Assembly symmetry: D3
Homo-oligomer: 316 residues x 6
Amino acid sequence: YGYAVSVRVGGKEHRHWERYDIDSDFLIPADSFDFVIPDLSGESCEVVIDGQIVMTGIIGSQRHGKSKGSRELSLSGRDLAGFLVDCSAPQLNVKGMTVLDAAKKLAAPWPQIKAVVLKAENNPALGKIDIEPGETVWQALTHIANSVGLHPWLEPDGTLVVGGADYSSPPVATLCWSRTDSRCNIERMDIEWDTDNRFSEVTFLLKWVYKDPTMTLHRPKTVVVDNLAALQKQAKKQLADWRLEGFTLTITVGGHKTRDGVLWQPGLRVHVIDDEHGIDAVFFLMGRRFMLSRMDGTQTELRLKEDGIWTPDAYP
Amino acid sequence: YGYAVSVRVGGKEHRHWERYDIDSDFLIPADSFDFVIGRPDLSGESCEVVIDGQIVMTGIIGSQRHGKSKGSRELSLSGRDLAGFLVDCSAPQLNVKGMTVLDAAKKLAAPWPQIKAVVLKAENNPALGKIDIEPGETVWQALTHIANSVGLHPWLEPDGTLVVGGADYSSPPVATLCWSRTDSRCNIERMDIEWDTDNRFSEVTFLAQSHGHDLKWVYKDPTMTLHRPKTVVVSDNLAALQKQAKKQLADWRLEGFTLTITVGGHKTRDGVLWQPGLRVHVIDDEHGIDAVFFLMGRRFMLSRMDGTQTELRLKEDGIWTPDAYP
Amino acid sequence: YGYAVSVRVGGKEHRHWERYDIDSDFLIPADSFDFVIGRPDLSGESCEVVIDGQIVMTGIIGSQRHGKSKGSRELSLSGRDLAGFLVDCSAPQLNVKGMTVLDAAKKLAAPWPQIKAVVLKAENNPALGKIDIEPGETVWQALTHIANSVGLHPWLEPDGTLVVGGADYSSPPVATLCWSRTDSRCNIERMDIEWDTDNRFSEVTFLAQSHGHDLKWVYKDPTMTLHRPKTVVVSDNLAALQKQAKKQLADWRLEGFTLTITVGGHKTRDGVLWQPGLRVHVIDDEHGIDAVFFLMGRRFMLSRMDGTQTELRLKEDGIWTPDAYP
Amino acid sequence: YGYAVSVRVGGKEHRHWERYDIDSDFLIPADSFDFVIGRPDLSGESCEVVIDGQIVMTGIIGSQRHGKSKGSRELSLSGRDLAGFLVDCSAPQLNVKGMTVLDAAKKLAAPWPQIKAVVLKAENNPALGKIDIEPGETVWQALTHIANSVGLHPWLEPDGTLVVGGADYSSPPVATLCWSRTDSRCNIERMDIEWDTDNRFSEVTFLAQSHGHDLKWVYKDPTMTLHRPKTVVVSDNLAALQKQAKKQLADWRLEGFTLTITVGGHKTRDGVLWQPGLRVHVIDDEHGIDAVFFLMGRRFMLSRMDGTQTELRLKEDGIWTPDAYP
Amino acid sequence: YGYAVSVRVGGKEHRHWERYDIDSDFLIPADSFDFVIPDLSGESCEVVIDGQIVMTGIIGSQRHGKSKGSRELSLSGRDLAGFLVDCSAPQLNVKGMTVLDAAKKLAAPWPQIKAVVLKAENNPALGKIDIEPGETVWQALTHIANSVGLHPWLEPDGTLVVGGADYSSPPVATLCWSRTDSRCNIERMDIEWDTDNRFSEVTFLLKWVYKDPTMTLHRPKTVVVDNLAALQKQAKKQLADWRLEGFTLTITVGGHKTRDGVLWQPGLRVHVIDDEHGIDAVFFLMGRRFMLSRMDGTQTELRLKEDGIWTPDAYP
Amino acid sequence: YGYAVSVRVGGKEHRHWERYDIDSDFLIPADSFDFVIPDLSGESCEVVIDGQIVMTGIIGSQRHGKSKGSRELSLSGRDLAGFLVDCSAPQLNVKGMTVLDAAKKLAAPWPQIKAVVLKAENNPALGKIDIEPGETVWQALTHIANSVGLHPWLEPDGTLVVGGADYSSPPVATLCWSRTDSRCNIERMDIEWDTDNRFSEVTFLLKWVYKDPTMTLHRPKTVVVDNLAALQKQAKKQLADWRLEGFTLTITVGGHKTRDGVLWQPGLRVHVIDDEHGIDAVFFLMGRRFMLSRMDGTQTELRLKEDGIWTPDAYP
Ligand SMILES: [Cl-]
Ligand SMILES: [Cl-]
Ligand SMILES: [Cl-]
Ligand SMILES: [Cl-]
Ligand SMILES: [Cl-]
Ligand SMILES: [Cl-]
Ligand SMILES: [Cl-]
Ligand SMILES: [Cl-]
Ligand SMILES: [Cl-]
Ligand SMILES: [Cl-]
Ligand SMILES: [Cl-]
Ligand SMILES: [Cl-]
Ligand SMILES: [Cl-]
Ligand SMILES: [Cl-]
Ligand SMILES: [Cl-]
Ligand SMILES: [Cl-]
Ligand SMILES: [Cl-]
Ligand SMILES: [Cl-]
């Protein structure tokens, strides 16, 4: 009669929690989990919710706390990017390599990562990417992927992807706000606009200048990014990433599933109607947090962005 | 985009509350209201409480507070419906026998022209028997006595009409409410159930003295193992003793169970303001409930923390004032 | 640098409180006190409450608590003024007619030599009429009856003197307090106003039976539209019926309005301890108030959160015990 | 590893509470219990409260609540011990003279076979005098009257036996509890002392009327300086008047002092469940206490914040029901 | 009947708030505001209180939040130093330039800053100041100004000043503490003494050594600051700045104006009497925060320093 | 009838507090204190509890706060390591020097530190340790000490030690948990396991490789540490330090003294029995916080580690 939130460690399954936070995000390298109810730290584990895999990772830390009136056991960790986030990238010449092959090679030391897949149309050969001493595997992978307009992330089953958004798939839920209409699902809504990365002119350095026509204020910027085609490619992606930073729509809904049974997952598009704020648009889900609390029960925070902006090269 | 809720006084709408509580109940005599805004002396003024242009209560502002400190100003208003007059003021020494129940009610409400109609909410309009009322009785007490003698009860309606009457269980439920931790179509925010065995007796011996204690009827539930006997004196034949004893047993039975549901908003899906006298179909698969309940009390609420809600005080179906509409 | 507040018991000063409440009121019989420090059995001991060497109350410690846990120890004391004896203990069956009011008060306080003077706080010292008191009456009840018969009221003064008397509205206001969100010279920290129409009646018929209900005086306010009649029996001529009915109307009128002001400190600017019986000029430009009010109750307070304050319970001027000093 | 606490109903153990309060007291008629878990209708069912397989109370579930919102479900149960029947139900008009106290108790508890034994907790089993009870008296009131006439008192024991009896001060204290901010062997978590002089009178004149107010005994404490006289009518010789007056003086004396100690757990070091009727040696060097106290009331408690504790309501030793075991 | 707190964005004026914090400070580069009650982010705006300009800036960020019981709109930003704080200083040789001219030149790209003024007696020519790659315009301006014993800040009308304190202007309010006397204005008082930058001997490096005579403890320091006159000038200013860090008097008063109608502003001197702590002195207001809260209404936090210590060269 | 918590500043003794935190730790450089009840900042001070010296330091900061209902005076500071933490290490060639002599020389500028002692069996000569510009005296001392398997800390009387743990001294208290048994002292217990510094293979760089046999997951690490004997010495110490980071047992007890009158102090071994969690072992106290609060009165937090792991060279 509730959500089956079924965690698996060492072939033991756990299904009953006082609270949790399970957070996935395209831009934050390693997705993470935290659960509150034997030393499980360092163990592999999986997170499923009503028959669908949600995260594959490793328990990083465990805490057992007690006082006279209470006793609690907590577990937290990250997905399998945790390895690539922590560990040093090798000296790798990826020039001429396929972005998928370079990603495969970077991930190779961790068999725990069992597939590496491309979520884009094509699989382009890479230029010379320098990897600096000290750089992590994730940093290296991000630079590589970003060089051809793509980005890395772990999927729920532990597959590493290098890819971008498919804006072709039709929105998979509609969410509305209403202080009247009880069909409406949205419990909380937070809208943020930020100007700190809007620039009036940006000079990228092989030189291309971008100028923002409606910007009346002076806010010049200069950026150090082989070919000029490789410049505007990478520069336009920087512009797109800054545009995305400038707006966030955070919606909290009850439960963990859409009104048709799909677990919220980054990558979905979501139609939002707020007749009161005058919103009727499609947004792109970039981050998603499954939450259970004593006070609010089960909810999902949905961190929604402007549609069509992120990784527009992946699938034009 | 939400509800327009006002306290209308002298044609003038007072709107924009930060919090309110509007409470109606068949058993509590005077329905009441309470409003606060936090960003003129109306005490003693006649008012109407209005939600989206529909009057939900007619009454009198009994009290007003203004409070100020550095950082806050709060104005509050409270009051009661027009039953407040009858609850406060004294019954005359009317003899009701056999004046119709509708005419003995009309009589008792006469001094308050502010109560502009008296209506019978019942199939039949019985000639009353002998009702002996004591002199410090309030109009309300007297009205309850009279009403209850014929298996009825008094209340005020939203527009200020006094009703003597009872429940109509022929009316189809107005809504189906359901509880679910996974079904988003289910809209119950909070469900509280209370069971109380205070007034659950093993045998109850009812006594009365005839026109001319010679009258005696005893009730037993063979499902009570515990010894808990009670004897009650009823104030003229085995028929009248049995009728009234049975009303007491039904009153006790109602006291034993309450289902309190909290919902967001103030209206059903088909636009009906929650109001006592409605029947509500409730489903809770977790608990195994699927039944119709009778709405005996309801509270319209606004808070900063929880926004707009209704508390629905629900009772077992078919039990209260069953004679009103057989 | 702040106030020295002590509970003096057996010449010994107990000082250094973390919190207290010292409450005086003309209408509540026994003024009270409550002290806590949080860093000897004095229960039943005689005490004086002293602020900056001035006694503000004379009474008896009724109760004491000591509480300890790891991290805190709290000692508390409560008590009442000397009216506590009269409130608790029984009146004799004195006949007062026409003993002077001052002599019937002296009589009733006689058993408590702890009350070391009885004073009349009134222009005239009327010979009392016939006052019929019932045997379980407390000295206080009896004293209130007697006092009220002649448009007076009893209280204890700070030094333990019993007063029968009333307000003096000839005394110039002792202070002007004002409210402002921009004027720093304005010193009111909190202003609460309450209006209540509970005891605001449309017509009131007063009845009494002569020496030898033949006495009847009815009051009406033509500004009441709502029907809210009341009849009151007063316990020997149209003059005495009218005098006492009017005192009841004034009591009701006082109940209908309270202005509660909170100020920092315990003294006016000219060094006067707030005390019931003072008149206070209040200005609130925001609200449109500029009037004099009569101080009926006051509470000296200390808390960790708010420090040193006084709550001032203010009433409409000129209404309470108007005969005491015409 | 902690206590197994259950509500046993129909052989079935309900365990796993998040919070409870189990309160027993010689002076409060019906001991009570309250349980909540927060992760079937048992109202009106017979139950036993059990700690580590030992029954601590026998009673009836009076009420049950289930509450649900998103994020919490809470089931609660309350009830009383078997004295609840006697407190609720009516005494017969038994004449007790001189039936033994044990036989007049047996009689009055007879209708509740649920009370399966009546025991006398006293040296002697006096033939009762003339006890005049009024008709709406409860079995409990009547039992208290009768019991108290012979310097005894009624209570229920954990297994459901009705006792008429008193304290045994020959029984050695069961435990020594001590308070210390530096001694870890000292186990008191919280110590609260209250002294109250409400019912401390200077002279008390006791009056009674003989078999055939001619009976009069007056008490004085020459340590009272304050005038606080009381007169009490007792309902047939200077011996019986003096016996009962003295019981009243002892009751008042007990009301004047309470020591409330809070301890972790529910058992003494030697495995005894805290229960009224035990004597407890208390040491607090800080306060200068080193004495034995009589346990009059006790509350087993569980909370999330404080875990498992017992509140021990302790009274001056040797004062309550001193005749029961001279 | 309250404070007219009148904010102006795009020629719309807003006057009614649930709360705000408006903070100005000589040492924190960009003053800031935050207000709680249409996308206003990136818009210019002004803050006035009862007819007197209080801050000129740009809305940096906006948030609209709502739940079932509540709805709130917040705006925050900084004064016009925000531009110079964010943006890269150019390669500028200021040698031989007047400090006012160098400040004018550094501010020139932002016409939004309409005047640049000197608040000192004279306007000295500067030495070679090196500006490092990456340094901001504010950092550069601070180094320049500091080189001649001065400091930069924005005034309420958006004028940039390079200057120092005028200790000649007489204290403009007296504030007292009293648990008795209700004429006394101070609601809260916080006094902080800190020793972390008191040194027993400081060697500045062209070498001058400072020695503290009452310092008994060993706490030596060495600092890397053209002329020797330029050394003791700049060294004595470092000593003065450390002395200032060692003591702060924070007073919270009700309202926003002195007992004669002047809005609290950094730069004023304030007589403080606390007969209870035994204080009777003049302090210099270095920072000022206008506050409105539900719980405490309108107040001002006044961050007061030792008189006469800061920028003693500006006006000897 | 309580703890005599007797602080001494300028020959004034203070004994009465609303709260305090007094924290000592082998790994955090400067132990610290904070007390809540005249400018005492910069003054030397001592902390004793019932006749036993507990900390020797310097008041770093003082605060006096008041509002209408309350007034409080706070003092905080650090032990005498505060000097060596703040100040620059000199250019010192410690090669051939005895570790005790090198420590003495590093501490010499602060006579406030009146003894420097070795808490190990022997006193080995040091190799070339380089001290970088900017390095503090404490950093230098730590590197020196660590180079020979030891560590620095200040003892309660202000003596500087370079040393390690004596695991020979028998446990000095037994602490138990019981929801029944009231003889049991433990009010709260927090157990933390963390895997972030467990590695599958560690290559130290003159090259030694460590391999963890039970580690199934790939987590390689490489570390830059004269002799090869000097490598495994220093490498094994790094391994031991990481092992210690992976587990902490935090126990809160009431009071400040063992059940035999010894003030809790880092360095003691403690037998812990938790029949409920199935713990029966000896742990090593690495950190200790004396606390007084209004809500919980006097307590000690005991930060306990795995026995025998830290500084195993000091006393084999
Ligand atoms: Cl990610
Ligand atoms: Cl599943
Ligand atoms: Cl990373
Ligand atoms: Cl009603
Ligand atoms: Cl009524
Ligand atoms: Cl509905
Ligand atoms: Cl009084
Ligand atoms: Cl009274
Ligand atoms: Cl004043
Ligand atoms: Cl009992
Ligand atoms: Cl009873
Ligand atoms: Cl014990
Ligand atoms: Cl600034
Ligand atoms: Cl203006
Ligand atoms: Cl900057
Ligand atoms: Cl340390
Ligand atoms: Cl000592
Ligand atoms: Cl360091």
